[PDB]
Amino acid sequence: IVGGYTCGANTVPYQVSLNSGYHFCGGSLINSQWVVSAAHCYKSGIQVRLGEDNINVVEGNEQFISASKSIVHPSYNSETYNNDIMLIKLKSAASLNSRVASISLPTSCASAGTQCLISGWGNTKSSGTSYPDVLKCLKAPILSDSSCKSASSFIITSNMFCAGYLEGGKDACQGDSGGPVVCSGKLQGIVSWGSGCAQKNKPGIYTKVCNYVSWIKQTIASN
Ligand SMILES: N=C(N)NCCC[C@@H](NS(=O)(=O)Cc1ccccc1)C(=O)NCC(=O)NCc1ccc(C(=N)N)cc1
Ligand SMILES: [Ca+2]
Ligand SMILES: [Cl-]
Helix, strand or coil, X not given: CECCEECCCCCCCCEXXXXXXXXXXXXXXXXXXXXXXXXXXXXXXXXXXXXXXCCCCCCCCCEEEEEEEEEECCCCCCCCCCCCCEEEEECCCCCCECCECCCECCCCCCCCCCEEEEEECCCXXXXXXXXXXXXXXXXXXXXXXXXXXXXXXXCCCCCEEEECCCCCXXXXXXXXXXXXXXXXXXXXXXEEECCCCCECCECEEEEEHHHHHHHHHHHHHHC
């Protein structure tokens, strides 16, 4: 997260770190057994880490749980990042508490102008490299598709939205991938893709979770 702020320990209790020997992606806890992340975060040997603040220190509120199944969206396109979403089932149910909590799925999509909370342990610099140990947060509004398209020249599918600031300086970044965009207590976005980080006229692009609720629900029902 570039141009954000320190969240505060366990202030984003649905925020997950995916670990494969090191933190490599975020995720969102959607019930005691399932995590939503980005399809581009798929890899073998994922351990889900709940209750994290400092990812390099055991602070006492963590739960580390292996993935038992990973389900990449059937239509994930690794060139365009269309359908950039994945479900991860936990080997064991997380113990839910004030610091490890699920986040609700949308009942309907959010609109341009709505303010959202974006979080993760990704790069904090728009130029160069700095990875935080503690969770970072950013408030950012959803942009209209038309303003985003004209500003960036990006192709934005129906399953994507732009959020952030066209002026640059505030954005998600590498390492935030797969993490939450929460708006009015609903998981509306997943950190997906972009062009650099916090650059002018290059806002963050996010998987539009509202389009996947039926898929998530039926997948969970049958797995
Ligand atoms: N030609 C097409 N259509 N390409 C789609 C993929 C574009 C790709 N862009 S990219 O390489 O600039 C992403 C990046 C890599 C290193 C450092 C900063 C940013 C990209 O974003 N790749 C996946 C990725 O790196 N995702 C992580 C990510 C998370 C947040 C942002 C952000 N600025 N909000 C950007 C990338
Ligand atoms: Ca920790
Ligand atoms: Cl529009």
